[PDB]
Amino acid sequence: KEAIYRQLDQTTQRFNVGLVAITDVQNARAQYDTVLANELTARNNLDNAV
């Protein structure tokens, strides 16, 4: 999650600068959103195991 967040920040910063399009930011946001679901699932699995 840390890595993906760092990547999203870079992509957003570049788009604002004017080097990429909106589609790249949308893809970065999708990738960042996916890891948020995975992180939540891991905690649920840990609690279920306990």
Next chain:
Amino acid sequence: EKAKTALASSVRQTHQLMINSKQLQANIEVQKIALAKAQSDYNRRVPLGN
């Protein structure tokens, strides 16, 4: 007659130099555009670096 022909030739050559001037000016414009592109790219790459 020979002298008059010589004068005509001299006039033509001088006009040719005058045109070469504008040619060089156009070349200068090309280089200026290249510099502007590089400057925009850098000014673009800078904030991300902070």
